[model samples]
Target: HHHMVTQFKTASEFDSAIAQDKLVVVDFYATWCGPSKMIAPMIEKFSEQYPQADFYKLDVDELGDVAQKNEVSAMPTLLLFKNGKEVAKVVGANPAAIKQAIAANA
Candidate 1:
């Protein structure tokens, strides 16, 4: 079964998602990056684990401007946004760190 992780196609859509949610975890992923896929399941798990926060996935290639605006220098960059402001950032596929960040901010 899959969790309710929304995928944003445009920067405006992404902006609105973060703007509307109290807490949001955005996974800036690349289609060709294997590491990005490695943490995909974990994101779904987190989505289930934390119902208070919304989860979103954005393809870096499709949304280059959005990724650039967010300063996504690497693949699989997980950013936790609160109140439309970035509160936490996880640069790699470290599940423990990501969960801690969400737990701390949520």
Candidate 2:
């Protein structure tokens, strides 16, 4: 399911990915979180189809500090970054809204 997505596993290396990619969407999630799991496949599908954006996943349980730094207070928070700055943020598992944000930013 995570084939096209990269894993932002460490806080030390997290900044570089967002800084380097022109378009980056980081999904801050938790394995035990229900909404996080539900939106994953949809996000994965979007990941495979969108080569224009770089998609990555960060486990809040594993990378709490990074998640905190990004102000991700909710599970499955989708943070859209462009040139190291956050452009948009989707806090829930709504595919429509996420899609809308993607397109608006695309």
Candidate 3:
């Protein structure tokens, strides 16, 4: 069976997931944000490119506490967490830029 990407709705859930010691790519987004919608397709395609890493989407609107904890002031923020710590963060809607950041961190 295909593994579904884990969806974290709270800061605690995110913290627990990262504690597992796997590489995690978290998309910090909001449902009503246009920029977030624009970049989601690219994020999905990128996730397919890196199946070994755990990929997740966190809606800032739904998880405001988590977003605040992460200092996410904008929609479509991508954070790469490794070993329970943030290794890289990408903001805005550039797939190529995100890929480059991931490569640097990975």
Candidate 4:
């Protein structure tokens, strides 16, 4: 799972992935948020489940500009991007709910 998953720390890294027409799944999180900590394992699990997509984690505290641009108000927001545009979004910590959202969009 770690091998297939790529870590994106900067906005440019994410932007590049989007430009390449990759299915980008971004987790907008912060270190201080308890919900974010709870969902970390689920993100790793989902990355393993969806090897076809690009899974990313962005720290809202670090990438403030990108978070603000995306209007991520929640701690564990999941944004699914296709062809550089956001096609679907799921906000919350429930792994089952997120999986359902991805399946519906997929």
Candidate 5:
């Protein structure tokens, strides 16, 4: 994870974060998930590159309810929210799709 990136451990913090930023990205991940760990660096890089957005990670195992509430069925689901509303998502290690979603949403 990047030094400047934000980390949220609870659902309320995440709720606040989504509303706080113009654009917010929530990475739904788990420690034992292969794809989630694999895309870790790309997410970190995105955190560095996309200063216009707020980047955060929510460990699925720790925050299973949050994942369920958000309807995340995959291991590495990257959700992009705008003003507390979900607008787009990118699954797996798909950088192109992530960029496209960001471009379309941002």
Candidate 6:
């Protein structure tokens, strides 16, 4: 029903994402859509390259509590999880850096 990576609606959905996947990519973004737009295509490329990883999106505006719990204060933060724990992160829309992190952790 969904594409390669879709926006997660609630906390429980995000919970299940990390629960089910070996590697999870959570994109925390804001309503302004800010820098989140720049890396959107790169993330899609990653989805193809790393089929084992599950990609997701979360709007900090919609789930501010979830973003806070993850210690994220900035928009367009990419959180990488392995085994249900935070293993890596890229705070900005830095494609090259995020690619390295994904490769290292994946």
Query: What lDDT does the true structure give each of the candidates?
Result: 0.87, 0.83, 0.80, 0.78, 0.80, 0.83
Against the true structure, whose lDDT is highest? 1
Give the number of the best model, judged by TM-score. 1
For candidate 3, lDDT tens digit of each residue in 19-64? 6576788888888888887766776777677766777888888889
User: Where does model 1 exceed 4 Å of error?
Assistant: 1-3
Q: What is candidate 2's lDDT per residue for 1-106, written digit by digit as tens?
A: 3467878869987788888657788888899999997766787888776768888888999999998888889898999888888899999898989987877765
Q: Is candidate 1 or candidate 5 better by TM-score?
A: 1
TM-score quality measure for candidate 6: 0.90
Residue-wise C-alpha lDDT for candidate 6, range 1-106, written one tens digit per residue? 2388888888887877886648898888886876876666778889888877888788888988889889998778999998788899899999888988888876
Which regions in candidate 2 have their CA more than 4 angstroms from the true location? Answer: none
Q: Write one digit per residue (lDDT tens) for candidate 5, span 1-106.
A: 3464566788888878888647788888888888887666776777677777777888889888889989898989999999888989888878888877766766
Model 1, C-alpha of 68: deviation from truth (Å): 0.7
How do all models score by TM-score? 0.93, 0.90, 0.87, 0.87, 0.89, 0.90
lDDT of 5 at 80: 92
Q: Estimate the lDDT of model 2.
A: 0.83
- Could you tell me which 10 consecutive residues in candidate 2 have the lowest summed lDDT? 1-10
Question: Comparing 3 and 5 by TM-score, which wins?
Answer: 5
Cα error, residue 75 of model 2, in Å, equals 0.9
User: How many residue-pair clashes does candidate 1 contain?
Assistant: 0
Question: Predicted candidate 6: what Cα RMSD to the true structure?
Answer: 1.9
